[PDB]
Write a protein that binds this DNA or RNA. Structure first.
Lengths: 97, 213, 63, 127, 81
RNA sequence: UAGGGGAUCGAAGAUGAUCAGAUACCGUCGUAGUCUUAACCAUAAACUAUGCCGACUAGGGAUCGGGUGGUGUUUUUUUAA
């Protein structure tokens, strides 16, 4: 062992899929299995934003974001501690926290 | 040697069809016996957010690409180059969980400019809508894109750049979409996103000097 | 050389590998209600008046 | 009553650029690469080179009369990472520290609509 | 359920259940005697058209065919049968 | 196998790294191939490593597709539909 009633990932009726390359592995790897995350943070950071709305010529502007998705191999997903190893049972979960 | 002793400046103006004409400065570079400087850095663009122009803060995002058509005095006047969103705000408005659409259509204005425009537009849900979503069907989208085509050739013939420009500032095309669309589908966010030049014809100094006073 | 004498209120949690650092709030004695959260190095309590010439770096929690 | 040079920053990895121009940028002015302010040659992308580097950008901008500034961040970008390296952060706070004003901030990281096949090879980069 | 009369159940449970299981099968579609307003005539139309039929000859239109049921025009009494 | 396509990855080949060696792991490029038309090959952990037909045993609670019934839930438009 089988491990994993899907298999790994996300594929059915669907036979074969357009793969993705890893940001990190820099491996290839289909858009099921994948393991995707939006960081999204303020370009700015906490410490400085105070020296920014300070010395700006803006009486405030706002604070524009920084968009991006992120693709991972499953290997580099665990090495980098994004995904862990959930006992057997805590697998068949699917919650953000 | 120094590479700022020689460096003569300049001033950037802008159509009048705008607010604070006043943009900041630029740097250029003098000449010799035979040979010239002014032309030597004209044709070129400058790109400034909608904002330091319309003054306003509602277009807080989105930038104007202007190009200097000719000099004077030190006050280099300007002709419209094109439009941009901030980026970011495009990549934000998109979510997971919902349909995304797309636009386009080229076009002989008449001023005889050739312009390509981009109308991105989403589905929105309903206010009151179990399901997690907000998707489209597909055939409805086919019908969605074709609508957009006409609604834009039409506000482009009915024309000019100057007359066109002040249909981009107050985002009035955005409205005209929603009211031919509702009589379908709900929609949100609806941009023009862009907008770029191609085949702009010959100078005509004042067809432009009539954009100032 | 401007010295801002800041009073410790809330001793928070232990830090560092070797426990050389506590965390630390602080109440600015000399501008009360400011209540920034720096670090320090010592065997601390609440009420250790604390000394900073660096007004302000505000600090973040170090392995 | 102020003038505006445009920034034109960028930090991948193993290097970073503080690179002032005009607001058009067919001309340019005081460009500062990392290695320059660090000969270890090791950390060419350091949260520091950037740090003493940006201060070159307000020495040779508070020289030729740049009060103030609008400010651009770029990744690699390309195929690459689109995860800004050290740089751009330390710069974006040292640049505020150097009298400079700030205005209009935004990424530019060159994004593709796919296509250029990324390096490594199928089975990947690997130690 | 340990048991039940499936002979005759409720009337309920049929109305909803699928045409081909009410036991004895029977259709849902049914016919609909139409006065276009002008004439008195009365044409015998079917609930699921596939054809729009014309009314009698007046050349009028009536009822468009869609997925299942016509959409009939404005005028039409459409008494069922 | 012969035409078309040749972005990206990327055996092979080249490389710089690491290493006692490193012809491998790590990094950057890279034909070929990945893609398609037309023709070959017929293998696989082709995996539930469980031949199919059937017929009978013991409880449940989910779900996809149908169908039946409940003056069943909203939709509201006037009641339905």
């Amino acid at each position: 062992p089988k491990k994993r009633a899907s298999n790994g990932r996300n594929k059915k009726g669907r036979g074969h899929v357009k793969p993705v390359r890893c940001v990190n592995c820099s491996k290839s790897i289909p858009k099921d299995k994948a393991i995707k995350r939006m960081a999204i943070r303020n370009i700015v950071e906490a410490a400085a934003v105070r020296d920014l709305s300070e010395a700006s010529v803006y009486p405030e502007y706002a604070l524009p974001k920084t968009y991006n998705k992120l693709h991972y191999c499953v290997s580099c997903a665990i090495h980098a501690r994004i995904v862990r190893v959930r006992s057997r049972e805590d697998r068949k979960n699917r919650a953000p926290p | 040697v120094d590479p700022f002793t020689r460096k003569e400046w300049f001033d950037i103006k802008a159509p009048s069809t705008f607010e604070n004409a006043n943009v900041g400065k630029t740097l250029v570079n003098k000449s010799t016996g035979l040979k010239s400087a002014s032309d030597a850095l004209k044709g070129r663009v400058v790109e400034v957010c909608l904002a330091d122009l319309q003054g306003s803060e509602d277009h807080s995002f989105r930038k104007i690409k202007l190009r200097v058509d000719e000099v004077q005095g030190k006050n280099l006047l300007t002709n419209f180059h094109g439009m941009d969103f901030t980026t970011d705000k495009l990549r934000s408005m998109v979510r997971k969980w919902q349909t995304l659409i797309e636009a386009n259509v080229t076009v002989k204005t008449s001023d005889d400019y050739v312009l390509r425009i981009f109308a991105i537009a989403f589905t929105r849900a309903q206010a009151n809508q179990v399901k997690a979503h907000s998707y489209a069907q597909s055939s409805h989208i086919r019908a969605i894109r074709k609508v957009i085509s006409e609604i834009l050739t039409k506000e482009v013939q009915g024309s000019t750049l100057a007359q066109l420009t002040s249909k981009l500032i107050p985002e009035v095309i955005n409205k005209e979409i929603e009211n031919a669309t509702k009589d379908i589908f709900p929609l949100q966010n609806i941009h023009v996103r862009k907008v770029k030049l191609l085949k702009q014809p010959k100078f005509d100094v004042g067809a432009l000097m009539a954009l100032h006073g | 050389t401007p010295v801002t004498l800041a009073k410790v209120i809330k001793v928070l949690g232990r830090t560092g590998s070797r426990g050389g650092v506590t965390q630390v709030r602080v109440e600015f004695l000399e501008d009360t209600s400011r209540t920034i959260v720096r670090n320090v190095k010592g065997p601390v309590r609440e009420n250790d008046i604390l000394v900073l010439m660096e007004s302000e770096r505000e600090a973040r929690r170090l392995r | 009553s102020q003038v505006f040079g445009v920034a034109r920053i960028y930090a991948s990895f193993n290097d970073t650029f503080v690179h002032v121009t005009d607001l058009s940028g067919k001309e340019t002015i005081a460009r500062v690469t990392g290695g320059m302010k660090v000969k270890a040659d090791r950390d060419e992308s350091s949260p520091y080179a950037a740090m003493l580097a940006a201060q070159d950008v307000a020495a040779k901008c508070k020289e030729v009369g740049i009060t103030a500034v609008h400010v651009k961040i770029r990744a690699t970008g390309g195929t690459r990472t689109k995860t800004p390296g050290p740089g751009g952060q330390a710069a974006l706070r040292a640049l505020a520290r150097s009298g400079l004003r700030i205005g209009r901030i935004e990424d530019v990281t060159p994004v593709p609509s796919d296509s250029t096949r990324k390096k490594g090879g199928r089975r990947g980069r690997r130690l | 359920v340990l048991v039940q009369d499936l002979l005759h159940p409720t009337a309920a449970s049929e109305a909803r259940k699928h045409k081909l299981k009410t036991l004895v099968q029977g259709p849902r579609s049914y016919f609909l005697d139409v006065k276009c307003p002008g004439c008195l005539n009365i044409t015998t139309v079917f609930s699921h058209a596939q054809t729009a039929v014309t009314c009698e000859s007046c050349s009028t239109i009536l009822c468009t065919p869609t997925g299942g049921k016509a959409k009939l025009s404005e005028g039409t009494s459409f008494r069922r049968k």
